[PDB]
Design an enzyme around this catalytic site. Structure first.
Site, PDB file in Angstrom:
ATOM      1  N   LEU A  22       0.321  -0.999   0.031  1.00  0.00           N
ATOM      2  CA  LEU A  22      -0.132   0.217  -0.057  1.00  0.00           C
ATOM      3  C   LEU A  22       0.980   1.623  -0.100  1.00  0.00           C
ATOM      4  CD1 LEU A  22      -2.891  -1.063   0.005  1.00  0.00           C
ATOM      5  CD2 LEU A  22      -2.932  -0.239   2.084  1.00  0.00           C
ATOM      6  N   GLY A  23       2.040   1.157   1.188  1.00  0.00           N
ATOM      7  CA  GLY A  23       3.210   2.775   0.318  1.00  0.00           C
ATOM      8  C   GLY A  23       4.092   2.221   1.516  1.00  0.00           C
ATOM      9  N   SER A  24       4.968   2.749   1.228  1.00  0.00           N
ATOM     10  CA  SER A  24       6.489   2.645   2.096  1.00  0.00           C
ATOM     11  C   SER A  24       7.608   4.075   2.011  1.00  0.00           C
ATOM     12  CB  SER A  24       7.085   1.413   0.932  1.00  0.00           C
ATOM     13  OG  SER A  24       8.526   2.046   1.425  1.00  0.00           O
ATOM     14  N   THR A  25       6.927  -0.002   5.869  1.00  0.00           N
ATOM     15  CA  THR A  25       5.861  -1.000   4.815  1.00  0.00           C
ATOM     16  C   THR A  25       4.171  -0.939   5.149  1.00  0.00           C
ATOM     17  OG1 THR A  25       7.959  -1.575   3.240  1.00  0.00           O
ATOM     18  CG2 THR A  25       5.805  -2.344   2.890  1.00  0.00           C
ATOM     19  N   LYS A  43       1.484  -3.001   9.174  1.00  0.00           N
ATOM     20  CA  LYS A  43       1.768  -2.620   9.125  1.00  0.00           C
ATOM     21  C   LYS A  43       3.013  -2.451   9.578  1.00  0.00           C
ATOM     22  CE  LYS A  43       2.438   3.046  11.543  1.00  0.00           C
ATOM     23  NZ  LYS A  43       3.074   3.421  10.968  1.00  0.00           N
ATOM     24  N   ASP A 130      -1.601  15.571  15.804  1.00  0.00           N
ATOM     25  CA  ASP A 130      -1.015  14.962  14.491  1.00  0.00           C
ATOM     26  C   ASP A 130      -2.635  15.077  13.742  1.00  0.00           C
ATOM     27  OD1 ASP A 130       0.848  15.419  12.183  1.00  0.00           O
ATOM     28  OD2 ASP A 130       0.321  12.583  11.775  1.00  0.00           O
TER      29      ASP A 130
HETATM   30  C1  LIG Z   1      -3.018   8.955   2.139  1.00  0.00           C
HETATM   31  C2  LIG Z   1      -2.080   7.425   2.556  1.00  0.00           C
HETATM   32  C3  LIG Z   1      -3.326   6.560   2.256  1.00  0.00           C
HETATM   33  O1  LIG Z   1      -3.333   6.659   3.215  1.00  0.00           O
HETATM   34  N1  LIG Z   1      -3.123   5.398   1.985  1.00  0.00           N
HETATM   35  C4  LIG Z   1      -4.198   4.786   1.058  1.00  0.00           C
HETATM   36  C5  LIG Z   1      -4.616   3.857   2.017  1.00  0.00           C
HETATM   37  C6  LIG Z   1      -5.261   2.773   1.931  1.00  0.00           C
HETATM   38  N2  LIG Z   1      -6.010   1.975   2.836  1.00  0.00           N
HETATM   39  C7  LIG Z   1      -5.561   2.007   4.747  1.00  0.00           C
HETATM   40  N3  LIG Z   1      -6.308   1.644   5.854  1.00  0.00           N
HETATM   41  C8  LIG Z   1      -5.907   1.928   6.577  1.00  0.00           C
HETATM   42  C9  LIG Z   1      -4.397   1.736   7.264  1.00  0.00           C
HETATM   43  C10 LIG Z   1      -3.417   2.525   5.954  1.00  0.00           C
HETATM   44  C11 LIG Z   1      -2.491   3.176   5.643  1.00  0.00           C
HETATM   45  C12 LIG Z   1      -1.707   3.522   7.379  1.00  0.00           C
HETATM   46  N4  LIG Z   1       0.134   3.948   6.802  1.00  0.00           N
HETATM   47  C13 LIG Z   1      -0.395   4.090   5.397  1.00  0.00           C
HETATM   48  C14 LIG Z   1       1.084   4.924   4.401  1.00  0.00           C
HETATM   49  C15 LIG Z   1       0.828   4.604   3.566  1.00  0.00           C
HETATM   50  C16 LIG Z   1      -0.115   3.648   2.995  1.00  0.00           C
HETATM   51  C17 LIG Z   1      -1.787   3.305   3.572  1.00  0.00           C
HETATM   52  C18 LIG Z   1      -1.410   3.818   4.998  1.00  0.00           C
HETATM   53  N5  LIG Z   1      -3.533   2.606   4.530  1.00  0.00           N
HETATM   54  C19 LIG Z   1      -5.569   2.319   0.832  1.00  0.00           C
HETATM   55  O2  LIG Z   1      -6.289   1.025   0.222  1.00  0.00           O
HETATM   56  C20 LIG Z   1      -6.999   0.997  -0.724  1.00  0.00           C
HETATM   57  C21 LIG Z   1      -5.385   3.221  -0.138  1.00  0.00           C
HETATM   58  C22 LIG Z   1      -4.697   4.069  -0.119  1.00  0.00           C
HETATM   59  N6  LIG Z   1      -3.969   4.401  -1.677  1.00  0.00           N
HETATM   60  C23 LIG Z   1      -4.684   5.518  -2.151  1.00  0.00           C
HETATM   61  C24 LIG Z   1      -2.515   4.751  -1.402  1.00  0.00           C
HETATM   62  C25 LIG Z   1      -2.258   6.231  -2.173  1.00  0.00           C
HETATM   63  N7  LIG Z   1      -0.810   6.729  -2.278  1.00  0.00           N
HETATM   64  C26 LIG Z   1      -0.495   6.532  -0.437  1.00  0.00           C
HETATM   65  C27 LIG Z   1       0.255   4.911  -2.580  1.00  0.00           C
END
Ligand SMILES: */C=C\C(=O)Nc1cc(Nc2nccc(-c3c[nH]c4ccccc34)n2)c(OC)cc1N(C)CCN(C)C
Length: 273
Positions: A22-24, A25, A43, A130
């Site tokens: 989902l993002g970086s 992990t 996470k 935050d």
């Molecule tokens: C705004 C950044 C983001 O959170 N993007 C995101 C999130 C989720 N779902 C999700 N659900 C619970 C927790 C988290 C989470 C906690 N820390 C992070 C760090 C990075 C990404 C997510 C995080 N996230 C998605 O589920 C499909 C998708 C998503 N997107 C749209 C990714 C967008 N960029 C940041 C890659």
């Protein structure tokens, strides 16, 4: 002080199936405890570990429709946080990406929901520190939740008293709620774009604040302004914000002016162990 009898669930690593990054992990995946598949985010040094366990402590201690829920931790090579997957992402990316599709009703309802979760956190005597549109996650466009508790007990979201005196209260949170609403109403603009953080302190003392967003009637912009009083006690209470934005969501277009107005799967919100 009351005893925190929150449970901390510890999960087997073989119960998870990481689907993709989902993002970086932080990964996306499925948690299978019971004939249920739970969609989850996951996470993944000693200082690092001490700071993810702090987050689990807070998240295991909250239970509210507009706050993010812990599902468990997993004690493998590193520590893993397992939370509910919010499939639409954070609210900052979402307003940026759907600029031309957000109605006034969605904006006002998000402001109610964020204020409801902040009011819950005040109930639980807990200071977020935050609050920001990047830390509000979208379950459905109808349903958002506050997240990211790594600081729970960013210069451009902080109350002036926090920048000057390292003082944080629920009223310093209301200031950040103010800046967060402004992110929404400007469809994701950057607060004080160009202005270097070192300067934010003196600007706010001179009486300046963020400017009225274009879709914003003076009614809405005056609520943001009240969140930005230098006198913390003069700022609105999170419970008054719920009331005020509620009355507005009953008639959204009087207040926001916008052109154009898989079988055993179970959301974490329906897995109530
Ligand atoms: C705004 C950044 C983001 O959170 N993007 C995101 C999130 C989720 N779902 C999700 N659900 C619970 C927790 C988290 C989470 C906690 N820390 C992070 C760090 C990075 C990404 C997510 C995080 N996230 C998605 O589920 C499909 C998708 C998503 N997107 C749209 C990714 C967008 N960029 C940041 C890659």
């Amino acid at each position: 002080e009351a005893p925190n009898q929150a449970l901390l669930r510890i999960l087997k690593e073989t119960e998870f199936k990481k689907i993709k990054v989902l993002g970086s992990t932080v990964y996306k995946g499925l948690w299978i405890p019971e004939k249920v598949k739970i969609p989850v985010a996951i996470k993944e040094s000693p200082k690092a570990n001490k700071e993810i366990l702090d987050e689990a402590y807070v998240m295991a201690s909250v239970d509210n429709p507009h706050v993010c829920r812990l599902l468990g931790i997993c004690l493998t090579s590193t520590v893993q946080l397992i939370t509910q997957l919010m499939p639409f992402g954070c609210l900052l990316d979402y307003v940026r990406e759907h600029k031309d599709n957000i109605g006034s009703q969605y904006l006002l309802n998000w402001c109610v929901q964020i204020a409801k979760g902040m009011n819950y956190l005040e109930d639980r005597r807990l200071v977020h520190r935050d609050l920001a549109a990047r830390n509000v996650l979208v379950k459905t466009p109808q349903h958002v939740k506050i997240t990211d508790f790594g600081l729970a007990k960013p210069i451009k979201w902080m109350a002036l008293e926090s920048i000057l005196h390292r003082i944080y209260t629920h009223q310093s949170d209301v200031w950040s709620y103010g800046v967060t609403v402004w992110e929404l109403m400007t469809f994701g603009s950057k607060p004080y774009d160009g202005i270097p953080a070192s300067e934010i302190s003196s600007i706010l003392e001179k009486g300046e604040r963020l400017p009225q967003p274009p879709i914003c009637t003076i009614d809405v912009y005056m609520i943001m302004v009240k969140c930005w009083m230098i006198d913390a006690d003069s700022r609105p209470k999170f419970r008054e914000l719920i009331i005020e934005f509620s009355k507005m969501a009953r008639d959204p277009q009087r207040y926001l002016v916008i052109q154009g107005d898989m079988d055993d799967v179970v959301d974490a919100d329906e897995y109530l162990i």
